[PDB]
Design a protein around this nucleic acid. Structure first.
Lengths: 132, 52, 132, 132, 132, 132, 132, 132
RNA sequence: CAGCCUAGGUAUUGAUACCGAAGCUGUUGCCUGGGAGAAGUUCCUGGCAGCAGAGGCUGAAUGUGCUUUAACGAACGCUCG
């Protein structure tokens, strides 16, 4: 799982944009790999983090955490660089046991991946419509 | 081996607790005081095992 | 956000299996819809819950939740009923401000999807390997 | 109501199975009639209870009970006995006034049968789907 | 099971009446859905209740309840209020174990429905004839 | 009371505008159906909510709440999307008792309707003129 | 907001009756205008009260209140003077901001009116049908 | 057996700090109780152990012991694990003759309290100065 | 306050058995954790206590605790006819 330039192709409403998160590094204090889209302003960039927690003595459960942050520009008609106004967050935490299995791990991965595309979650996040 | 012996005596005390008895529970209590300790009133199981 | 049967195809490590989750009853206790394997017994085994908490005092900031759970069970050589030996589960969340816009919500959706498809997360998840 | 072997047809998911319930007589203490389906194993027999309490003192509470039971065993490896491992219960209880009349009593019956066939209870109990 | 106008026909002795029950929604407390007959006086509306509780602890005992209420008033002389003087009640309760399958469950329903249609309960409750 | 696209005709001071509330859903936590005008930014839509509270053991009186909120955009000349500035509240609360009648309730309905139309409330709301 | 006779036409289920409301005294303890049936005694039965609460340390933020009270009474067969056996009533409360505009206030007014005129509210009120 | 919550006040020189001590158990060997602050950390939780003895053989006078621990809880310690750096011991011991009186005990009790409250002992316990 | 019960909760091989709180719902505060964007903060997850949303039936106090606060038979007021 070595870090490197991640290029998400088609994403968005109409599915036309693409994202290029460049490789920042890994905070070692918490074992967190990070990726950012190309820019200059730390406060104005789409960011993603991946972390892999092994079964601690007080946990005994494997954890994978993946976060995504996207800030709004709301650039003003002058008067300085833009200002962060809104911040979209997404967080996923997958969890297994020590005798976990590759296959059902990938199974859960793909299950959630296709759920994210199914029309239910579409209008559940898209239009904020309660599942109903 | 001395640790094992200690744990065995503790297990005896706990089994006495589980079965339920106030007077018979003192089997181990008599193994430390080095003396004929007499009662004073009506005690309780967990009370005579938590720090007794 | 209508509830119905969802058939997610191209699932798993090689993306060949398929899962059909049929609807359930929308939990009055917390307003959360539920989907489950086509059945029969797997209907009470596999679960996919979806909820959208509206802005509130704790919530400001709409909060969308998706919890997927897959219990692995087995039958001992002599038993009859299958007992759960393991339990998979993952939890995705999107917290979105009151002024959020639907375009960016879907961007977040598609970004999370494309990352889950990215080799990086399949490596760190399916193989449980810190990115290094 | 003379007891006789009752033949229930068009039953099950697809409505093609049949049940032949033969009378088990009446308990003399409980004053309740019982039927059971013919089988080799008395313990594996689908049973059917019906009770019609008479009006008590000062309230009269015209009361009827119907207790249907259905077991399902699974002979374990090495066991020479099909131990009942599974049981389904269904108890219906009708309550009428001392001035109630055949008309609405029959009405209520037909109502309950119709709902029990209706789509609502159908998915309410087949799939254990809460109604919302 | 989505609530909707539930229309049951062919009821009564003759099987020529029809009931239209509209959705009354769900108690957020008991988590129970409710349906009512459309009428002028809500106190004089035929009501029907559907409940399906969730797994409990350590026995887990899936349960479903249906309560049928049919009132009937009788406007007394000088009284401008059709006071409810009669009430018919029918409580149905299904108990399944968490190993249950929709096969057996639908088998239960159909058995109950056909039993409610058989001459057995016909004479048992239409005329309050204890069965023997 | 099936939810549907509400197409509200001429309204406003001169009565030329038309509004389209698409059905969002029904929060079960308090059994409240919600409609919102078609848009993207949840913070900037006109919405309505309807609740029908049944007679509790603690109140024993049917309640019908109709809440309406209208936001004002006050879009700024750049720098971000508009911000909620003004917030028009309206809330109507019909109450009736268990032996109430449909004719009575419709009477109250149309009564409030035509008073809303009448010159009095016209000047009392539009002009904030004290009834005088 | 002048007080005078209001002829409220096309009322009720069929929209055929009419209500003539004649003015009352404005309660100086609270500044509320009142309207009552044309009479005679129903002037002491039906009521329509109107209030315009101005900004304050609590109000800021005008509040316009319109309360409607209609008691249904009957005469016991042998009594003379009718007693109120029933009481319907409703209240509308507009909360308008200081910089509110008559355009917006009228728009909300007509919105309420026509929603009250809409199928949704008519069956949510008359039949007390929750929106499902 | 002491099972009482003590809501202390006027802590520190400023006198504006308050504390609460909740019982934690009794030590059925030496007549000792235990009380602690609300929390889950040794350093953040202050200890109060009172103990009362009776004459048996070794001594002919009572003993009222009181041990209070006020550990200094440091926030920044390399992680979110507030540890202890300065342990605050406070040991009080009494000895009363079996022919003493509640009056005499209260006398010593109040004299101790007053000396502690006065500026006499404050200078020797806080500023650490000898008797000039 | 005491008791009585149940409407419900419960389980049960059905029959039978405990309780009346049940139960969940939300809310006040106590609120730690674990993980962590990296935060001039938002997100993942968690527990404790309290409040409000089951019900009535019967008797006891009219400021509160309890120990001679009592029992018998007539008269009086005082309800009825």
């Amino acid at each position: 799982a070595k870090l490197e330039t991640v290029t998400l192709g088609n994403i968005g409403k109409d599915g036309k944009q693409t994202l290029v998160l460049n490789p920042r590094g890994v905070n070692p204090t918490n074992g967190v790999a990070s990726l950012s889209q190309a820019g200059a302003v730390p406060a104005l960039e789409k960011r993603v983090t991946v972390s892999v927690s092994q079964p601690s003595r007080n946990r005994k459960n494997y954890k994978v955490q993946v976060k995504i942050q996207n800030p709004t520009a709301c650039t003003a008609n002058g008067s300085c660089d833009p200002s962060v106004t809104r911040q979209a967050y997404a967080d996923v935490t997958f969890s297994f046991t020590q005798y976990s299995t590759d296959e059902e791990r990938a199974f859960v991965r793909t299950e959630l991946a296709a759920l994210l595309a199914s029309p239910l979650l579409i209008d559940a996040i898209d239009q904020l419509n309660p599942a109903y | 081996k001395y640790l094992g012996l200690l744990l065995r005596r503790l297990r005896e005390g706990y089994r006495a607790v589980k079965r339920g008895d106030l007077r018979a529970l003192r089997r181990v209590i008599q193994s430390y005081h080095n003396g004929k300790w007499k009662p004073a009133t009506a005690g309780n199981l967990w009370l005579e095992f938590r720090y007794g």
